[PDB]
Curated annotation (Swiss-Prot):
Keyword Metal-binding appears in the UniProt entry: yes
GO molecular function: cysteine dioxygenase activity; ferrous iron binding; nickel cation binding; zinc ion binding
Cofactor binding remark: Binds 1 Fe(2+) cation per subunit. Zn(2+) can be used to a much lesser extent. Ni(2+) can be used to a lesser extent.
Keywords in alphabetical order: Dioxygenase, Iron, Metal-binding, Oxidoreductase, Thioether bond
Name of the protein: Cysteine dioxygenase type 1
Length: 186
């Protein structure tokens, strides 16, 4: 049924096709991303880790239609609570496991933020979020093993908001790249 990419390169070629149009079948993309079985030999050149925080490694720019990146989560590394600037956001496990916590959007009022969902992303699993779905944070469940995830964001975006869990108050964040196309960035 689902078109099974046999390599990361096959998957990228398919994604160029699915995003060439104006419509995007979210469930179709999710299934094909999930069908690709992670192969470290194919993405090791992008798995550039850092001691203190997770890293963002650009893989492909999707002919301007999407950002395809790989995120490298060290032991105990996790994200802030954040939004996704009106884009489709697909997140596939390549190695290890992320805990995904979904949060409701805060009010004008200051308040502890509310969890809507909490789950562990399995091997090769592809998850999906956008701003209408909620906010989230992802965390490596392991303090002894890394996690690696493949992210597709459509359209691409440079900035999002981080939210304080005690308050709901938000700061604008400009996202940066640790490496692009396997090459380290300034
Ligand atoms: Fe996210």
């Amino acid at each position: 049924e689902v078109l099974k990419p046999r390599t990361l390169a096959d998957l990228i070629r398919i994604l160029h096709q699915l995003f060439a149009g104006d419509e995007v079948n979210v469930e179709e993309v999710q299934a094909i991303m999930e069908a690709y079985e992670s192969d470290p030999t194919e993405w090791a050149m992008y798995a550039k880790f850092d001691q203190y925080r997770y890293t963002r490694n650009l893989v492909d720019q999707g002919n301007g239609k999407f950002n395809l990146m790989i995120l490298c989560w060290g032991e105990g590394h996790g994200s802030s609570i954040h939004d996704h600037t009106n884009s489709h956001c697909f997140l596939k496990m390549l190695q290890g496991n992320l805990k995904e916590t979904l949060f409701a959007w805060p009010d004008k009022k200051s308040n502890e933020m509310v969890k809507k969902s909490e789950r562990v992303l399995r091997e090769n699993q592809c998850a999906y979020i956008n701003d209408s779905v909620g906010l989230h944070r992802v965390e490596n469940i392991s303090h002894t093993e890394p996690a690696v995830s493949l992210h597709l964001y459509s359209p691409p975006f440079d900035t999002c908001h981080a939210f304080d869990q005690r308050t709901g108050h938000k700061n604008k964040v400009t996202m940066t790249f640790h490496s692009k196309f396997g090459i380290r960035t300034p």
